[PDB]
């Protein structure tokens, strides 16, 4: 059953909290960064909720997936070198 008495906390943790891909790259419709789950949808990389200045990627791939609080949410579309023929 539930134990009680003189003792401190226990059990370690791991989200984890890293960053997938990065600026200037063929960021596919995966999930860049995603430090925390439940990240809303975003048709691009990110660039908000931080120091002045927005981020941008050289190539995109139909929507994406980035955090909701940090880096994001969704605003303007960015994609250097138009993905078109001729």
């Amino acid at each position: 059953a539930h134990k009680k008495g003189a003792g401190s906390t226990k059990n370690g943790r791991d989200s984890p909290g890293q960053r997938l891909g990065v600026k200037i790259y063929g960021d596919q419709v995966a999930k860049p960064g995603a430090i925390i789950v439940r990240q809303r949808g975003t048709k691009f990389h990110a660039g908000k909720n931080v120091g002045i200045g927005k981020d941008h990627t050289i190539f995109s791939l139909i929507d994406g997936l980035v955090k909701f609080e940090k880096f994001g949410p969704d605003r303007k579309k960015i994609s250097v070198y138009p993905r078109e023929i001729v």
């Binding site: 048709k43 949410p73 969704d74 605003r75 303007k76 579309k77």
Partner: protein, 122 residues
């Protein structure tokens, strides 16, 4: 004494919305009314520029009574139609519904409806 930050009016009337941001900028429709007249504008997006901008006064030039009332709802639809038509001729209907401060039946109810008379349909 101590600097205080207060969110401006145009920052609490729920002006900017999500979804529509699917594009760098959504084709909003500047339908604001002053303290005497009303100014309409089909501002484009991307960076700037617009398709067609009309006003209550400008209409007086085409065909309207001189000392005629402007705040009247009758003029609303007139200001929404004058800005239209030519706006479509510029290329293709690229106007949406954007207005934060008019309780639906505001002085813009005719402005948005006027757009549904030239081609813009949703």
């Amino acid at each position: 004494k101590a600097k205080t930050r207060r969110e401006d009016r145009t920052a609490r009337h729920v002006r900017i919305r999500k979804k529509v941001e699917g594009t760098p900028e959504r084709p909003r429709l500047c339908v604001f009314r002053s303290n005497k007249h009303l100014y309409v504008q089909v501002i484009d997006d991307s960076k700037m520029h617009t398709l067609a901008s009309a006003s209550t006064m400008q209409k007086s030039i085409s065909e309207e009574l001189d000392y005629s009332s402007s705040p009247t709802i009758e003029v609303a639809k007139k200001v929404g139609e004058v800005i239209a038509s030519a706006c479509l001729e510029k290329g293709i209907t690229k106007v949406a519904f954007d207005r934060g401060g008019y309780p639906y039946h505001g002085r813009v109810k005719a402005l948005a409806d006027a757009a549904r008379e030239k081609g813009l349909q949703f």
